[PDB]
A paper describes a structure:
YceI proteins are a family of bacterial lipocalins (BCNs), which are small proteins widely conserved in Gram-negative and Gram-positive bacteria but whose physiological role is unclear. In this study, we discovered that secreted BCNs contribute to antibiotic resistance by capturing and neutralizing antibiotics in the bacterial milieu. Visual inspection and structural alignments by the DALI server confirmed a barrel-shaped lipocalin fold for both proteins. An octaprenyl pyrophosphate was bound within a long, hydrophobic tunnel extending from one end of the barrel in each structure.
BcnA is a secreted bacterial lipocalin required for full resistance of B. cenocepacia to different classes of antibiotics. To elucidate the mode of binding of antibiotics within BCNs, we first solved the X-ray crystal structures of BcnA and BcnB to 1.4- and 1.6-Å resolutions, respectively. Analysis with the PDBePISA server predicted that BcnA is a monomer, while BcnB is a dimer, by crystallographic symmetry (~2,840 Å2 of buried surface area including a portion of the tunnel opening). Superposition of BcnA chain A and BcnB chain C (148 Cα atoms, 22% sequence identity) resulted in a root mean square deviation (RMSD) of 1.66 Å. The largest structural differences observed were located in two of the loops that make up the tunnel opening. Using the established crystallographic structures, we applied molecular modeling and docking calculations to predict BCN binding modes of antibiotics. These studies suggested two distinct docked binding modes for BcnA. One binding mode involved residues in the rim of the lipocalin pocket. The second binding mode was predicted for more lipophilic molecules (e.g., Nile red), occurring deeper inside the lipophilic tunnel. Docking of α-tocopherol showed its alkyl chain buried in the BcnA tunnel and its cyclic head placed toward the entrance, similar to the Nile red binding pose.
Numbering used by the authors: 5 to 163
The structure:
């Protein structure tokens, strides 16, 4: 499987002179994938949500708090695949369970895969609604302040 230092998971939000992008500095992931048997593959990711870095300590503290991630109550977010559907041209629709702030949803993410030497790379973007996971509640429900749509971007490098 993977390499954190070589890999990146980020989230892009809007409001609306944006992107505002933050990156999770601590996560793990496991991938098992052979394009000759793609549907037999699997992947999981576990993110340490308190490691989310927007490049600003006050923003980082706010987003860790109860109305946002509530990182003390829910320290991790997870994705676990259940199916992989080839989409043609090194693209695969990867379906699985995304759990954020203790709320689970089935999601399908388009992933592009490349191999070069002993390295495999997995790139994709998953749009979600933060409200679906109750991320940014209370006064932060107002989507004229922070948009509901958040794009989760990942670049996973294995071996
Ligand atoms: C074929 C194969 C095997 C492929 C591999 C498959 C594979 C590994 C796929 C991976 C797919 C996925 C889903 C990967 C990600 C996995 C996980 C667990 C993702 C969860 C990440 C996560 C916690 C996402 C939630 C992100 C959210 C909703 C973040 C909130 C966004 C945020 C913090 C916005 C804050 C806005 C900011 C910084 C400031 C606002 O400032 P403000 O005060 O309002 O300014 P003003 O007042 O001026 O307006």
């Amino acid at each position: 499987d993977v390499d954190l230092a070589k890999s990146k998971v980020s989230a892009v939000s809007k409001q609306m002179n944006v992107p505002t992008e933050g990156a999770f500095k601590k996560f793990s992931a496991q991938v098992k994938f052979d394009p000759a048997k793609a549907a037999q593959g699997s992947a999981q990711m576990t993110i340490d949500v308190a490691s989310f870095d927007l490049g600003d300590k006050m923003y980082n503290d706010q987003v860790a708090g109860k109305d946002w991630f509530d990182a003390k109550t829910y320290p991790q977010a997870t994705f676990v695949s259940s199916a992989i559907a080839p989409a043609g041209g090194n693209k695969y629709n990867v379906t699985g369970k995304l759990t954020i702030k203790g709320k689970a949803e089935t999601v399908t993410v388009p992933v592009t895969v490349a191999q070069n030497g002993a390295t495999q790379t997995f790139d994709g973007v998953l749009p979600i609604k933060r409200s679906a996971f109750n991320v940014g509640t209370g006064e932060w429900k107002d989507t004229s302040i922070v948009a509901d749509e958040v794009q989760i971007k990942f670049h996973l490098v294995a071996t």
